[PDB]
Structure 1
Amino acid sequence: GRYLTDFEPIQCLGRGGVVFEAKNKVDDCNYAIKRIRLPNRELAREKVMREVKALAKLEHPGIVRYFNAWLEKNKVYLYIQMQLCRKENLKDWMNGRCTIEERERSVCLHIFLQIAEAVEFLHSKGLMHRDLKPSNIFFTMDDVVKVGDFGLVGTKLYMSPEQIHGNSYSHKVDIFSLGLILFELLYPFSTQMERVRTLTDVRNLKFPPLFTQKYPCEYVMVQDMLSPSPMERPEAINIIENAVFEDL
């Protein structure tokens, strides 16, 4: 139907539903289009449709721009048309910059700040992200940082304990992810294995001595954001207003 009639597929961008890059025939722009298999049960399906109505009202510099949502009968599919972001995500970005010198403090903090501001926005709306990790943080063609796909529903490396264990949870889950991301932005790794060895240590509040001495302030921030107890993690607003971000 509409998808095949109105768009030309270009390439698959990810699966987990699926996300395609596709060109709209009429306006000639390329878009990221997510196809989601709709639940068969009436109640579960209504939950998804309610979430679409909420998200579609969102407008913020850190949130990917929304264009359209529609259904198609195969089982029913929900299609979501978003602005196409760059192929290089934040994971790639850090992979191409494995030395301190390639990670200018200022640039790194400005990246993180945009993420935290998008998160603060969602929390203020009574929403949470739940899936914050570098492979799911994007750049626009004009280099604006975007939190990635969320709502309407991989590595657990950035996932809070309570979220991993299926315990009751709040917006505080996003703060835990932010903590690990801030550390990772400021601490380049030589190899993939070193990355995993170190991050699993950070999760458990064991930091590289070089980091604690190079970044004493970000260090206590990260420590707080990574409290195993969610009540103890700072509000996104508190993080955004931290002194470390005062040099603009």
Structure 2
Amino acid sequence: RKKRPEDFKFGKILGEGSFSTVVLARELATSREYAIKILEKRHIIKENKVPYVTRERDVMSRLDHPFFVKLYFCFQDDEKLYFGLSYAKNGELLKYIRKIGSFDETCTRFYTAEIVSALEYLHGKGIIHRDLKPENILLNEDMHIQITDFGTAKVLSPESKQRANSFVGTAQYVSPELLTEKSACKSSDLWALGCIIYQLVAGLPPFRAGNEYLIFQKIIKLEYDFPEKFFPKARDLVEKLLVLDATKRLGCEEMEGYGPLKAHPFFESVTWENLHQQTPPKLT
């Protein structure tokens, strides 16, 4: 049959959006924990964004991978919509970056590789995330990544692939092409990847300033710098991702795809087929 709010005990808030919350929920019957995404219909109705919410729901129902959140169930209330998602016990990657300052090389390689492997799967389904960043990369009980927040995700097509883009994600991770021509492709997610790797090694994202206009100006100029203490092979990797021309980013279709990305020297040691079974290095 169907589930109702009364079937659950609602605990701590795991996430806070403007129009939404994610709450830790225990299903009383089974005692299984879920992260439940709760949407107020009022806001969705009022902004005429129903098609967008269904899009999120559908995109998520296509995900069956260890590195991605899973949609288990959906039910409905008088004033609220509920999505039951996998619960990532250890919270946001950002929390760990903040706690230890920056990742050592072992940890950088390991988590970058999970992210790259996650992206190859996602993109292989014609799906782009569009808001990739450390706060949307969670860690599960086993400290593997769980990529989440599919509210901005889009299914791509070859006609789509190339100037209508509706959504501009978080300023620090946005690619130049989203800003200037309102294009959004797989490559734009690869730009975000480069920002994230840089952030893991350096402790903070590459493009930084006192407001979003100033951050955008740095992005479109490619105005950023590596600190002296930056793993050389990660720097080469980052330099091959943070490239203004979207068709020249390591990993995009035009650069012969994921093969060359996974074959970058920073990933020499990585065994790509068994990642989700490896015990992750301790974060220190």
TM over 0.5: yes
CA distance in 1, matches of 2:120, 2:11: 34
Q: Report the secondary structure of 1:36's partner residue.
A: strand
Percentage of matched positions with identical amino acids: 25
Calculate the TM-score normalised by the size of structure 1.
0.82
Total equivalences in the alignment: 236
Q: 1:209 and 1:55, CA in 2 relative to 1: closer, same or farther beyond 3 A?
A: closer
Q: CA deviation at 1:4?
A: 2.5
Residues 30-83 of structure 1: CA deviation (Å, up to 9, x unaligned): 211101245439x95345435523421311121123311233332xx4311111
Residue number in structure 2 paired with 1:142: 142
Deviates more, 1:164-173 or 1:22-31: 164-173
- Normalising by structure 2, we get a TM-score of 0.72
Distance change in 2, residues 1:35/1:149 (3 Å): same
Matches within 5 A, 1:11-160: 11-16=12-17, 17-38=20-41, 39-40=44-45, 44-46=49-51, 48-74=53-79, 77-98=80-101, 103-151=103-151, 155-160=170-175
Cα distance in structure 1, aligned partners of 2:32 and 2:130 = 30
* Secondary structure, aligned partner of 1:96: helix
State the partner residue of 2:8: 7
| Equivalent position of 2:184 in the other structure | 169
Q: 1:186 aligns with which of 201, 212, 215?
A: 201
> For residue 251 of structure 2, what is the aligned residue in structure 1?
235
| CA 1:205–1:195: 2 relative to 1, 3 Å | closer
Q: Judge conservation of contact 1:180–1:202 (CA < 8 Å) in 2.
A: no
In structure 1, the partner of 2:266 is: 244
Which has the higher mean CA deviation after the structures are superposed, 174-183 or 157-166? 157-166
Q: Quick one: distance in 1 between partners of 2:27 and 2:179?
A: 39
After superposing the two structures, state which structure 1 stretch, 81-90 or 146-155, moved more: 146-155
- Of residues 217, 242, 246 in structure 2, which corresponds to 1:226? 242
Give the Å deviation of 1:105: 0.5
Residue number in structure 1 paired with 2:233:
217
